[PDB]
Write a protein that binds this ligand. Structure first.
Ligand SMILES: CCn1c(-c2cnc(C)nc2)nc2c(-c3ccc4c(c3)[C@](C)(Cc3ccccc3)C(=O)N4)ncnc21
Length: 900
């Protein structure tokens, strides 16, 4: 118990709330989650001790690898006859050995060649390869070029520097995990829903804590929903004065109880009124986590309305009671049937489905004629098959008419042969019919596997059914690589919020992965931790974090170092940002330096892992290199030395901007999308180099941004001394001065290509207007953008954010005055055309990634109408050639010529 108490304190520190707060929660779903989730913890720990110590090292230092071993053409073409030059260092004093080897050599073979080289100058299974300058290892027998560091080196024409290291020197530094099961580990009739012959009704008793002025009459609005879809008409109570909110009114709903789907929810509000306004809203699950239909009395504390939403109900909103109990509390009563009513078992559901299928297969021509949702097997023509195929290739937010829905449902057995149509078929199901839903379940049960990218759609707010979501998860388990899981983790974390219950298949999958791959676990922790201030999710996220922190092993202690460092920076910046706001930069800096040198602060702010990338060790702070930036919120530009033995080879100092006051969630999302765009272009042989620098939200409007070394804003360059006297050639002159001689062409090429990428990316995403201060350029010509605080339809009709002025065209056309009518500009135009269509071809991915972020509280991504902006910029309703022409016209109009 002494050890457990010490652990609980550590967990409490990591999560920002004491573990005893979870102990006090009475709700049995909460206590069941805490206990039942521990088998995932056990399973993970068993995987980590399977082939110890290798398996422990693989957890801590997983291979940082691309999904596909196979290289593109333009990557392979960088290799000298499929061979790579690599430098292998040995500590003995630092001895480099330069090897020329085949790109697809395994680490063991590379090590052998390094020893063979060292031999000539005058075994293999005792060593491992480490990347020089950071804590990344090549512990697994992949092709060398599949490691991302290696593939990145080949792309950029940089020399790979790897360090030879004894296995036992690594293994020795990996403490043993001793996972201990916590204390909490040790802990009428029953009738089917389908037997209850009755309509649905619910009683609204009264509201308490209804405090108001403006407001005159009020009523309780209600509705039965499956996701965002109504299952019957809404039902209002009688009108009442706000000074006495009592209704005592049974509402009757147009739905039979046996037809209630598993994820059916009651969505209600309190409204004032003719102009109607909702004062407070709340949703609840009609079945609980044990499959029991709610019965008896219930008190629901309601939530405040968010501005932007003016609709009367909020079915997309969170489900469950407000934790703040000093809020409008509506009391409700459900119907009682002398018995516990439970949702039926799968065997009962399957039997019903088989009964229906058998029944339908016997239907005559004339019977089938009675409903467009019925078809006969023989009738299915090739023309119907083509129409189905055509419906399947439409994007996720393309409308499916009622006629198409009937059509899809009637040909649901054929839809099995085109399994990517599943999302469209599922939205065609009558979710208020048990006859249809039972058959949908049996189709889902045996549905062929779909790609993870397609499966992820089925985890958004449009697909609440647990069988559909379970199918989605099975697809990720079979087909989602750790690489792609890392890439889509932000979205996968967000869709946890749409789960009806704490314990579910998705959260079990994510937790297992977080606890078997520490690179995943790190960001899993930080994405959860960053929203613990949000009361609509803090319980779910807090309990999930608890379960992670109990089983993640030694990394908990490293996370607590990061948490303490961030907490010290939050505290310092809060003080600057309140007590010294008015003071000069000089005095603020004097205060900051004095506070950071206090030995407790100094120890907390040095010697820990970068939250932006835990492969990067942050050593001693260089206070002389730190500064408070001019910007409004007083961001800290911070500089630590990299204490790696071979830091000189990667970077000697790690520079991070810490910012306390701005919401960084949209930048973080935009940077993720840019990286995904870049990856699509690279995999297609289209080499447009982007710069998706690190950005991590760590809390409520607090986060970290990776500094891009040796870069400058456009303004600085064209400022020089010089505005009325600005000259279009100044930027070209700068780059040229920086790239004299044989390299000039490489710099112009890099500028051109990077420019094309950002032109296309920013137009597609509707990013905030570009100007000379939020466009930056590196010495080598790489152009990139910063500050992605705005996106999509943020103006309110499609803007062009990145207007190529004469400055940029002059660089592209190598100094020529008439730069719009040149060869270089034509090749640049061609790059933009290819990039644009390449993204159009992957439009469903981008739509789905945005759809998964809808239930986040990001101000410019509130509904599917915001996402519709992308449908416009990618011209998805148009033809591919019509889309090209549309893109050309937007560029043409914005540039006043050039694009035709
Ligand atoms: C890639 C991320 N990144 C950002 C950035 C910030 N905020 C958001 C939301 N996004 C991106 N700024 C970045 C800067 C940068 C910004 C402003 C600026 C300078 C550098 C200098 C040149 C140097 C300086 C002086 C005093 C204090 C600090 C720096 C200067 O005088 N003003 N350099 C690299 N990378 C950046």
């Amino acid at each position: 118990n002494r050890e457990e108490k010490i652990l609980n304190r550590e967990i409490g520190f990591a999560i920002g709330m004491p573990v005893c707060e979870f102990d006090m929660v009475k709700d049995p779903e909460v206590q069941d989650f805490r206990r039942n989730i521990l088998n995932v913890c056990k399973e993970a720990v068993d995987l980590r001790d399977l082939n110890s110590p290798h398996s422990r090292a693989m957890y801590v230092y997983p291979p940082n690898v691309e999904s596909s071993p196979e290289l593109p053409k333009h990557i392979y073409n960088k290799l000298d006859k499929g061979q790579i030059i690599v430098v292998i260092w040995v500590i003995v004093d630092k001895q480099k050995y330069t090897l020329k080897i085949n790109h697809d050599c395994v680490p063991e073979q590379v090590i052998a060649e390094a020893i063979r080289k060292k031999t000539r100058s005058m075994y293999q299974g005792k060593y491992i390869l480490k990347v020089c300058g950071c804590d990344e290892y090549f512990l697994e027998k992949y092709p060398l070029s599949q490691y991302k560091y290696i593939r990145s080196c080949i792309m950029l024409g940089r020399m790979p520097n790897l360090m030879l290291m004894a296995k036992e020197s690594l293994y020795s530094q990996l403490p043993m995990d001793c996972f201990t099961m916590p204390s909490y580990s040790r802990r009428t009739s029953t009738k089917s829903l389908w037997v209850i012959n009755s309509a649905l009704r619910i009683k609204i008793l009264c509201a308490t804590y209804v405090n108001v002025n403006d407001i005159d009459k009020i009523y309780v609005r209600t509705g039965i929903y499956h996701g965002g879809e109504p299952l019957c008409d809404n039902v209002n109570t009688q009108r009442v004065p706000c000074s006495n909110p009592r209704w005592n009114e049974w509402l009757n709903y147009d739905i039979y109880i046996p037809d209630l789907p598993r994820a059916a929810r009651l969505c209600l509000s309190i409204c004032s009124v003719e102009e109607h306004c909702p004062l407070a809203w709340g949703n609840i699950n009609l079945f609980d986590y044990t499959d029991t239909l709610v019965s008896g009395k219930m008190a629901l504390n309601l939530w405040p309305v968010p501005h932007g939403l003016e609709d009367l109900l909020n079915p997309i909103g969170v489900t469950g009671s407000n934790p703040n109990k000093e809020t409008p509390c509506l009391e409700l009563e459900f119907d009682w049937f002398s018995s516990v009513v439970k949702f039926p078992d799968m065997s009962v559901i399957e039997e019903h489905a088989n009964w229906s299928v058998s029944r339908e297969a016997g239907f005559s021509y004339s019977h089938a004629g009675l409903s467009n949702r019925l078809a006969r097997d023989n009738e299915l023509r090739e023309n119907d098959k083509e129409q189905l195929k055509a419906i399947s290739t439409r994007d996720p937010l393309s409308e499916i008419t009622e006629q198409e829905k009937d059509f899809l449902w009637s040909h649901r057995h054929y839809c099995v042969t085109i399994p990517e149509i599943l999302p469209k078929l599922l939205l065609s199901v009558k979710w208020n019919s048990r006859d249809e839903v039972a058959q949908m379940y049996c189709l889902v049960k045996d549905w062929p596997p779909i790609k993870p990218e397609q499966a992820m759609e089925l985890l958004d707010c449009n697909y609440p059914d647990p069988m559909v979501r379970g199918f989605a998860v099975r697809c990720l388990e079979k087909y989602l690589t750790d690489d792609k899981l890392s890439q889509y983790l932000i979205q996968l974390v967000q869709v946890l919020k749409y789960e009806q219950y704490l314990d579910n298949l998705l959260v079990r999958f994510l937790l297992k992965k977080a606890l078997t791959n520490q690179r995943i676990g790190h960001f899993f922790f930080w994405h959860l931790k960053s929203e613990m201030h949000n009361k609509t999710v803090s319980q779910r996220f807090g309990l999930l974090l608890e379960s992670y922190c109990r089983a993640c092993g030694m990394y908990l202690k490293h996370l607590n170092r990061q948490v303490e460092a961030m907490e010290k920076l939050i505290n310092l910046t809060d003080i600057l940002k309140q007590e010294k706001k008015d003071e000069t930069q000089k005095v603020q800096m004097k205060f900051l330096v004095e506070q950071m040198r206090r030995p407790d602060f100094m120890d907390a702010l040095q010697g820990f892992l970068s939250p932006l990338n835990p492969a990067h060790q942050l050593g001693n702070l260089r206070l002389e290199e730190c500064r408070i930036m001019s910007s409004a919120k007083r961001p800290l530009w911070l500089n630590w030395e990299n204490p790696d033995i071979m830091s000189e080879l990667l970077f000697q100092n790690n520079e991070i901007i810490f910012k306390n006051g701005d919401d960084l969630r949209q930048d973080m999302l935009t940077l993720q999308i840019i990286r995904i765009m870049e990856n699509i272009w690279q995999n297609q042989g289209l080499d447009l180099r982007m710069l998706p620098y690190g950005c991590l939200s760590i809390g409520d409007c607090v986060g970290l941004i990776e500094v891009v070394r040796n870069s400058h804003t456009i303004m600085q360059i064209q400022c020089k001394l010089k505005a009325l006297q600005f000259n279009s050639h100044t930027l070209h002159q700068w780059l040229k001065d920086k790239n004299k001689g044989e390299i000039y062409d490489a710099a112009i090429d890099l500028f051109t290509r990077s420019c094309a990428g950002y032109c296309v990316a920013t137009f597609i995403l509707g990013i905030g207007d570009r100007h000379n201060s939020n466009i930056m350029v590196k010495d080598d010509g790489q152009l990139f953008h910063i500050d992605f605080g705005h996106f999509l339809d943020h103006k309110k009709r499609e803007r062009v954010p990145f207007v190529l002025t004469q400055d940029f065209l002059i660089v592209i056309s190598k100094g020529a005055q008439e730069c719009t009518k040149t060869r270089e500009f034509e090749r640049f135009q061609e790059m933009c055309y290819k990039a644009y269509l390449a993204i159009r071809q992957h439009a469903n991915l981008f739509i789905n990634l945005f759809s998964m972020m809808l239930g986040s509280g990001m101000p410019e991504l509130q509904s599917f109408d915001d996402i519709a902006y992308i449908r416009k910029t990618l011209a998805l309703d148009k033809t591919e050639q019509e889309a090209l022409e549309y893109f050309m016209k937007q560029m043409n109009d914005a540039h006043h010529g050039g694009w035709t």
